[PDB]
RNA sequence: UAAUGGCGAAUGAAAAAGAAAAAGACCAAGUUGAUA
RNA sequence: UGGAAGUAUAAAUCGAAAAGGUGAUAGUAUUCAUCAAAGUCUAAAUAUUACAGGAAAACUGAUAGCAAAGAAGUACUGUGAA
RNA sequence: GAAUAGCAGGAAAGCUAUAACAUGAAGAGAAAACGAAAAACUAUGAGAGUGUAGAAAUACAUUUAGCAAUAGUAUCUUUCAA
RNA sequence: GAUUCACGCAGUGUUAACGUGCAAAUUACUUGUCAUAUUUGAGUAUAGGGGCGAAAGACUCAUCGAACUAUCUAGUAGCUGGUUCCACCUGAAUAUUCCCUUAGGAAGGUCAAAGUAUUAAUAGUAUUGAUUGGUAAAGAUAAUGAUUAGGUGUCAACAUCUUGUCAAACUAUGAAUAAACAAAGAAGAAUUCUCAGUGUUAAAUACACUUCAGGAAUUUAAAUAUAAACAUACUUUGAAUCGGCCAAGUCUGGUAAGCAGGACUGGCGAUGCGGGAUGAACCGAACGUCGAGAUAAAGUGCCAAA
RNA sequence: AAUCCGACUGUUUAAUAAAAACAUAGCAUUCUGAUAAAUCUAAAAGGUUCAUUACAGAAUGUGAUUUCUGCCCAGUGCUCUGAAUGUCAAGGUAAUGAAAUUUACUUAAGCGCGGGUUAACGGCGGGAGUAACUAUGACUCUCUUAAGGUAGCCAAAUGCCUC
RNA sequence: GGGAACGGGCUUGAUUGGAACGGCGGGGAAAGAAGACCCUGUUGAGCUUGACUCUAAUUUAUCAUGUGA
RNA sequence: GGCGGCACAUCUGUUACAAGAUAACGCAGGUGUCCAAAGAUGAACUCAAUGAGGACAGAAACCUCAUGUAGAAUAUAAGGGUAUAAGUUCAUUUGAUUAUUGAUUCCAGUACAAUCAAUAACUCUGAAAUGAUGGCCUAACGAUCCCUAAGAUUUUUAAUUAGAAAGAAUUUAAAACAUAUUAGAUUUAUCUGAUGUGUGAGACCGGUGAUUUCUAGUUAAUCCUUUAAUAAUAAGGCUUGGGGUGUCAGAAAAGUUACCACAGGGAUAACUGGCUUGUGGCAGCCAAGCGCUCAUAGCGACGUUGCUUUUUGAUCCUUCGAUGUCGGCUCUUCCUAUCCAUUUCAAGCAGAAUUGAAAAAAGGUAUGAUUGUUCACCAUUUAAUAGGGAACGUGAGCUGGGU
RNA sequence: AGGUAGAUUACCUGACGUUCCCAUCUGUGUGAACAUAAUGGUACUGAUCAGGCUCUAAGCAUCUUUACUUCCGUGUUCGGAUGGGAACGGGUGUAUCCUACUUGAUAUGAACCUACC
RNA sequence: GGCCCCAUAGCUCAGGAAGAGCACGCGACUCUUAAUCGCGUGGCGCAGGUUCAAGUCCUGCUGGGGCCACCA
RNA sequence: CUCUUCAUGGUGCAGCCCGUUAGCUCGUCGGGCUUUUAACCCGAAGGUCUUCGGUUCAAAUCCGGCCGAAGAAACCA
RNA sequence: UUGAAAAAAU
RNA sequence: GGAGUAUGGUCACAAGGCUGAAACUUAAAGGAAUUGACGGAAGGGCACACCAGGAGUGGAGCCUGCGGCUUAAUUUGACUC
RNA sequence: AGGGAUAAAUGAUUGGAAUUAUUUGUUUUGAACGAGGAAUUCCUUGUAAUAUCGAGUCAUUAACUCGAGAUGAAUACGUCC
């Protein structure tokens, strides 16, 4: 929902409680050279039409939120998953 | 078996190693031109 | 295709060489290893349910064994393939 | 009776072949890289004796034994993790 | 591309005949039509996701909402039918989990056959002891609600004392039946002496665990009833099955149902015999082949034994 | 003597439907200058209309004659002699890197915007106020989505209620 | 009567002489046909459509070097 | 079956039967969220309501005292829990974190998910004991493959210095050419021959020693792989989250067939039959009244008890390798809950015409317009023109009007 | 006798009144500093002038409540079992188990460690 | 049968702390009328249940309207 | 998912892609013109320019998530 | 450029 | 007036043409000229009618009259120049 | 310090009677109004405009009317819009 930045939490690398900078994780752009996409592009070549299933029955209206609690002095990130929330904001 | 596959159903070789039999020869290109 | 950033063939375009190919994870570089493509022929070891000639059989013994143990692909059916 | 090579006999049968390999003797890890003893411990448990007695059968007491099996232990190999 | 008759043709009606017919579409009368959008022979052209169609999915060799014929092909079927000698022994299921699952499958339960272990490894039972529950019941100014009135105190109202009747989604109290323990297995008890390693601790000689650490002596087979050695504990492999139905000193939906669905048990299914005349379930009682005897349910005027 | 359908002659489900069904002439619409339009074929100096040439060829709806064909271009089709950087591919160019790669700019048709089109597919409702008996509304504002059933016709082979 | 709730067979009764001819149409839940109405199959086929995935024909851009501005 | 609904994943009370399990398209409701505080901790206070008082101020504003077992509040549905709190107010803070075990709940004793008990860190609050790994508890959710993020500096090594200790190391036939010197040629990114040499060499004589340890520094690399060796890009590994399947153990999916086809089914509908009789028909009991007087000549309200299968329902037991599915015509038979004729009783029965009831089913109970109609409504005639059953009698008896 | 800490958590609670303080406890005085809030009312701290006035503790009452006992009553209900009775509905007999509400009698606390009177 | 809704002056319709028009009567205006204006009469279907207060929230009853239904 | 666009009184349309304090009509009230009515004219009220930030001397107006609609294109858990 | 209308008998 | 309408006949493809009533209703309908009034008809003059201007009023406070509202009554006449 | 509205104290005149203040004196109170929209009035020379004086009403009461003088514009000598 509303979670402020600058959270002070335990950092495994430094083995200490250091101030962390909190952000929100977003899925990165899909690479065109990974094994799964490389294999898929080969399958789609040639005749036969669509060769792999296409999902068309979405039911979830929300998604789980993953933060990036990042070390401010050692750059050690942590991924923490929150519950499903409809509206999420990063507070002050 | 390695691998391939809505990596699902399924498909799937080869070097090595052991035997049968064993055998290598030519064109073109290059050279020789009282040239055949 | 087992060959997975392409194992092989073909088509469109492109297209080498004071050579070069391969070492299957794409790329550049330096070494190493091993061959030298884009012409041709080549016996022996292997396959065989055409067909012909033979020999065998824990095979069948006339509703069985070939569809057919007699003028059997015959009698008979169909316009015809059958 | 892996192909395969010999023997007598003439044999789809029989016999002989220091033999590649298959399973197994060592296990864990994706992989690199590794690779097992405190010559074990505890508990209950199979068998064998001796004596006395009922007295025909056999039962009571004592000495010894530790197998199989189950369970738990220390130790050791591999794994982020047994 | 007028009206009619005739040779012919068609197929309006009888919904006549026939309907194992003359005929795998015919016959009789009746009706319509009977030359120019006419009738007809032969030749020739058009071929299967094709042809041809004044259009009915009509016709394409008795085959058409996609011909015939041969191969793939013994296509696939969770669906239907059938599945072949005798005797003997043991003998089921309709729970649970998952499935594009509901006419079907896999884990699991019931069951069979093989193979074991002297075996801390017996109980669909009763008694004694300490417990758990909130059902039947009961209560109704005892908590939450429902509801009939009568007094007393300051029309009504609000207090307070009585009265009548209630609750599956109310409760103080609370059975009967039940559920889970104990009634002596580190191997059948107890006591005395000795006693170690860790740790708790303020430190411990307390305490905790260590085969009631360990070790040695003495005593000892005791500690509810009943039953149980072809007992008990299993191990492995695997078949069939998960459409069920019935009864009730039971329940829920429904007016009710030989209706629909559940808790506990016993049955039919898988089951014959004696009785209820006949009946899957009711009553007695479960079955190798017989002889004799008392019996069961139930019967004793005749059918019919008494 | 009347009513319904079809205008007429004609054709049709060989073997349960011969008819109001099909055809028909009449009316109307669309495309095409022939190297075209339609359209068969895998391909082809290949093939059909076509030995043809707009009084023609090809593709459709309605069905003689008479009378009349109302209003709507919002949506979906079709079309345009229309506008441009709304969105749109491989490619092309350029930058970085050792190179693959990565990044950026540009590029056609198509759709979207704008106009036309209903004898193109189709649609033709609702609310409020109003005439001197009541009633209705000739008349005015008006929302969806563009217009709100016109001329006619009717318990119709079309009307539940309905005998 | 009970039974699978409409028996020719079973139980209890009514009743029966063996063989049959011509009719007729009550029954034999008469014959003809692995229901065609309905449902179930993770069985099909014709037809339709911006159902999903594709494809012929149509169309557009780039490539494929004729000479001179 | 369809349409409707989700009993498909799921929570609360009840059905439900005082252990556990537990049915219906049973009943009353609920979920796909919300929260940087509504998490954690410490402190203080006590809520709803009632009584008595105080200007506006009243039934409801704010203040004070007394009583006040929660009758308030606790994000939500319901049920549980809670008073020096779990409620309200204030203050600090992020434990809503990392790593490893062993259990409990559905359980097949699988996964997911949830519920716990500890250990090793680093922290929050408090003086402290303690408490803290999200929300007081029971719902608030998700596989293989794919994609996308986070993590593997702890340690182990190689080379070189200083010191220390153990150390023969296997044994005769040789080709690449890094180089040099010459021989024959070419001008070009210039080559082709032949002879020395080392390389590339290895057979040590109790001591030398090539070679591996240990200690102290320095330097470089340090999660694994791309299989001849490295490098920097790229890709693949290993662990943990996110992107989702709501048909919730998780295919990628529109209709119509009346032209339809196949395997099957009474596991399952349309017709009879069977159980039931709400509904339809008929019949009773009581007596408030009507009937000018008079409850019962004739009716009988409010209540209440039955019979019938002639209507329609409810169920799905028989029939799906077929029981010919409406009506009419013809014909026979049966029931009485009787319409007429026959014999009787009663009246608010003078006669006539009637009305209520008993015996009795041997006899009779019609003709037509409209409709396929059963039904209906008309016009007549008659002593009367009654009501029903027989597989809703009757299609190898007819018709084919309806469906 | 009193005070601190408790364990059982109403025989301990609630209402109307009553009895002492000799020690202790309490109420009581004050606000400079620690510290406290709008208020020295709370909490905090400093003290001892007075008081048993309330607390607290001990007792009273046909006291509500609460805890034991008989009775209610072998009454309601219940396990087993008929070819027992009834058209149903419901209700016996047999061998068994046996509540609750109510009313009546009794009680109104017992008990542990430390200090001081 | 089920479901949705409505019930208010003499008439047609509005409304948690009883109205609009039509109807009648009175008055203003005019020389007199017709129109027009102002004012007054003219009453929530019934019975409970919560609230300090209901036409206004809910339940039961009465009356009146429109709407759903395929193969056999 | 990518690109692009729009949102303003009760209503519909304006507005400056730099900016300095927002208008035109219908709708309401009142007044004016007319002998009177209808048309006609005028004034007032009516939004502060969707919601939060930055952008400065100030934002409907320049830029960002957020709202809530529209157009084109794409889709392996 | 726009300019519609004025109830009946007296 | 009804009415060139209904009906009858006839001509035309049709629109329509030719012939052609009655019922009923009503004291006027109409013709030419006169005078007046009016004209978003022409011609000629005039007026603070306008033009060129001044002061203004309309905006504000107050005085005053009218309407409306109110009230026991707010007495009433006059409503374009 | 323009403006003098609305109010609060107080002093007198007229009146038989002053309250809803008759008129007025002293002090204090210090409001709108920053030149005025559409419309619209009056005016051509001692005229408009500006400020004042007398009289009618009158016990007391002018911001009214009828007259009187005091300063002294601009713009026309025109046309029917």
Short mmCIF file of N, CA and C (backbone and C1' of nucleotides) in Angstrom, two decimals, chain H residues 253-277:
data_model
loop_
_atom_site.label_atom_id
_atom_site.label_comp_id
_atom_site.label_asym_id
_atom_site.label_seq_id
_atom_site.Cartn_x
_atom_site.Cartn_y
_atom_site.Cartn_z
P A H 253 -8.59 -21.88 -24.40
"O5'" A H 253 -9.26 -21.87 -25.85
"C5'" A H 253 -9.59 -20.65 -26.50
"C4'" A H 253 -10.63 -20.83 -27.58
"C3'" A H 253 -12.00 -21.32 -27.10
"O3'" A H 253 -13.01 -20.77 -27.93
"C1'" A H 253 -11.11 -22.86 -28.65
P A H 254 -14.07 -19.71 -27.34
"O5'" A H 254 -15.15 -19.54 -28.50
"C5'" A H 254 -16.24 -20.44 -28.62
"C4'" A H 254 -17.33 -19.86 -29.50
"C3'" A H 254 -18.61 -20.67 -29.62
"O3'" A H 254 -19.48 -20.46 -28.52
"C1'" A H 254 -17.93 -19.90 -31.76
P G H 255 -20.76 -21.39 -28.28
"O5'" G H 255 -21.79 -20.94 -29.41
"C5'" G H 255 -22.63 -21.89 -30.04
"C4'" G H 255 -23.19 -21.36 -31.34
"C3'" G H 255 -24.24 -22.23 -32.00
"O3'" G H 255 -25.52 -22.02 -31.45
"C1'" G H 255 -22.64 -21.53 -33.61
P U H 256 -26.53 -23.25 -31.26
"O5'" U H 256 -26.98 -23.60 -32.74
"C5'" U H 256 -27.57 -22.63 -33.58
"C4'" U H 256 -27.81 -23.18 -34.96
"C3'" U H 256 -28.33 -24.60 -34.99
"O3'" U H 256 -29.73 -24.66 -34.81
"C1'" U H 256 -26.51 -24.39 -36.49
P U H 257 -30.44 -26.08 -34.60
"O5'" U H 257 -30.79 -26.54 -36.08
"C5'" U H 257 -31.13 -27.89 -36.35
"C4'" U H 257 -30.51 -28.36 -37.64
"C3'" U H 257 -30.37 -29.86 -37.79
"O3'" U H 257 -31.57 -30.48 -38.21
"C1'" U H 257 -28.34 -28.82 -38.39
P A H 258 -32.46 -31.33 -37.17
"O5'" A H 258 -33.69 -31.82 -38.06
"C5'" A H 258 -33.51 -32.11 -39.44
"C4'" A H 258 -34.29 -31.17 -40.33
"C3'" A H 258 -33.93 -29.70 -40.18
"O3'" A H 258 -34.09 -29.04 -41.44
"C1'" A H 258 -36.20 -30.04 -39.55
P C H 259 -32.79 -28.68 -42.32
"O5'" C H 259 -32.43 -30.04 -43.05
"C5'" C H 259 -33.41 -30.76 -43.79
"C4'" C H 259 -32.87 -32.07 -44.31
"C3'" C H 259 -32.61 -33.16 -43.28
"O3'" C H 259 -33.78 -33.84 -42.87
"C1'" C H 259 -30.78 -33.02 -44.77
P C H 260 -33.68 -34.97 -41.74
"O5'" C H 260 -32.37 -34.57 -40.92
"C5'" C H 260 -31.62 -35.54 -40.21
"C4'" C H 260 -30.29 -35.78 -40.87
"C3'" C H 260 -29.47 -36.93 -40.32
"O3'" C H 260 -29.91 -38.19 -40.79
"C1'" C H 260 -28.08 -35.05 -40.59
P A H 261 -30.06 -39.42 -39.77
"O5'" A H 261 -28.59 -40.03 -39.68
"C5'" A H 261 -27.92 -40.46 -40.86
"C4'" A H 261 -26.47 -40.77 -40.60
"C3'" A H 261 -26.18 -41.73 -39.46
"O3'" A H 261 -26.39 -43.09 -39.80
"C1'" A H 261 -24.70 -39.89 -39.35
P C H 262 -26.85 -44.14 -38.67
"O5'" C H 262 -25.53 -44.37 -37.81
"C5'" C H 262 -24.42 -45.06 -38.35
"C4'" C H 262 -23.25 -45.08 -37.40
"C3'" C H 262 -23.48 -45.78 -36.07
"O3'" C H 262 -23.39 -47.19 -36.15
"C1'" C H 262 -22.37 -43.72 -35.71
P A H 263 -24.05 -48.12 -35.02
"O5'" A H 263 -23.16 -47.86 -33.73
"C5'" A H 263 -21.83 -48.34 -33.64
"C4'" A H 263 -21.27 -48.13 -32.25
"C3'" A H 263 -22.18 -48.60 -31.12
"O3'" A H 263 -22.01 -49.98 -30.85
"C1'" A H 263 -21.42 -46.40 -30.68
P G H 264 -23.29 -50.89 -30.52
"O5'" G H 264 -23.50 -50.68 -28.96
"C5'" G H 264 -24.70 -50.12 -28.46
"C4'" G H 264 -24.43 -49.18 -27.31
"C3'" G H 264 -25.58 -48.98 -26.34
"O3'" G H 264 -25.65 -50.02 -25.39
"C1'" G H 264 -24.66 -46.88 -26.92
P G H 265 -27.06 -50.42 -24.74
"O5'" G H 265 -27.50 -49.11 -23.96
"C5'" G H 265 -26.82 -48.70 -22.78
"C4'" G H 265 -27.69 -47.76 -21.98
"C3'" G H 265 -29.17 -48.07 -22.04
"O3'" G H 265 -29.59 -49.18 -21.26
"C1'" G H 265 -28.86 -45.79 -22.47
P G H 266 -29.25 -49.34 -19.70
"O5'" G H 266 -30.68 -49.66 -19.08
"C5'" G H 266 -31.85 -49.35 -19.83
"C4'" G H 266 -32.57 -48.16 -19.25
"C3'" G H 266 -33.57 -48.48 -18.14
"O3'" G H 266 -33.51 -47.47 -17.13
"C1'" G H 266 -34.66 -47.30 -19.87
P A H 267 -32.55 -47.68 -15.86
"O5'" A H 267 -31.09 -47.38 -16.42
"C5'" A H 267 -30.76 -46.08 -16.91
"C4'" A H 267 -30.09 -45.25 -15.85
"C3'" A H 267 -29.80 -43.80 -16.25
"O3'" A H 267 -29.93 -42.96 -15.11
"C1'" A H 267 -27.78 -44.90 -15.68
P U H 268 -31.34 -42.28 -14.75
"O5'" U H 268 -31.33 -40.92 -15.58
"C5'" U H 268 -32.39 -39.98 -15.46
"C4'" U H 268 -33.12 -39.79 -16.77
"C3'" U H 268 -33.89 -41.00 -17.28
"O3'" U H 268 -35.06 -40.56 -17.96
"C1'" U H 268 -32.27 -40.38 -18.87
P A H 269 -36.48 -40.51 -17.21
"O5'" A H 269 -37.28 -39.37 -17.98
"C5'" A H 269 -37.18 -38.01 -17.59
"C4'" A H 269 -37.53 -37.10 -18.73
"C3'" A H 269 -38.79 -37.45 -19.50
"O3'" A H 269 -39.98 -37.02 -18.87
"C1'" A H 269 -37.05 -37.01 -21.02
P A H 270 -41.35 -37.83 -19.09
"O5'" A H 270 -41.75 -37.52 -20.60
"C5'" A H 270 -42.16 -36.22 -20.99
"C4'" A H 270 -42.55 -36.18 -22.45
"C3'" A H 270 -43.63 -37.15 -22.88
"O3'" A H 270 -44.94 -36.72 -22.56
"C1'" A H 270 -41.85 -37.23 -24.42
P C H 271 -45.89 -37.63 -21.65
"O5'" C H 271 -46.31 -38.84 -22.60
"C5'" C H 271 -47.52 -38.79 -23.35
"C4'" C H 271 -48.14 -40.16 -23.48
"C3'" C H 271 -48.22 -40.99 -22.22
"O3'" C H 271 -49.30 -40.64 -21.38
"C1'" C H 271 -47.41 -42.33 -23.99
P U H 272 -49.31 -41.07 -19.83
"O5'" U H 272 -49.76 -42.60 -19.85
"C5'" U H 272 -51.02 -42.98 -20.40
"C4'" U H 272 -51.13 -44.47 -20.58
"C3'" U H 272 -51.18 -45.31 -19.31
"O3'" U H 272 -52.46 -45.32 -18.70
"C1'" U H 272 -49.68 -46.30 -20.86
P G H 273 -52.62 -45.22 -17.11
"O5'" G H 273 -51.78 -46.45 -16.54
"C5'" G H 273 -52.22 -47.78 -16.76
"C4'" G H 273 -51.23 -48.79 -16.23
"C3'" G H 273 -50.81 -48.62 -14.78
"O3'" G H 273 -51.78 -49.11 -13.87
"C1'" G H 273 -48.90 -48.99 -16.10
P G H 274 -52.23 -48.21 -12.62
"O5'" G H 274 -51.04 -48.41 -11.57
"C5'" G H 274 -50.59 -49.70 -11.22
"C4'" G H 274 -49.29 -49.65 -10.46
"C3'" G H 274 -49.21 -48.62 -9.35
"O3'" G H 274 -49.84 -49.06 -8.16
"C1'" G H 274 -47.22 -48.56 -10.64
P C H 275 -50.68 -48.02 -7.26
"O5'" C H 275 -49.57 -47.31 -6.37
"C5'" C H 275 -48.89 -48.02 -5.34
"C4'" C H 275 -47.91 -47.13 -4.62
"C3'" C H 275 -48.48 -45.81 -4.11
"O3'" C H 275 -49.15 -45.95 -2.87
"C1'" C H 275 -46.46 -45.40 -5.26
P U H 276 -50.50 -45.13 -2.59
"O5'" U H 276 -50.05 -43.61 -2.59
"C5'" U H 276 -49.15 -43.11 -1.62
"C4'" U H 276 -48.82 -41.66 -1.88
"C3'" U H 276 -50.01 -40.72 -1.96
"O3'" U H 276 -50.42 -40.28 -0.67
"C1'" U H 276 -48.49 -40.28 -3.74
P U H 277 -51.97 -40.11 -0.32
"O5'" U H 277 -52.43 -38.86 -1.20
"C5'" U H 277 -51.79 -37.60 -1.04
"C4'" U H 277 -52.32 -36.58 -2.02
"C3'" U H 277 -53.83 -36.37 -2.00
"O3'" U H 277 -54.12 -35.00 -2.25
"C1'" U H 277 -53.14 -37.00 -4.17
#
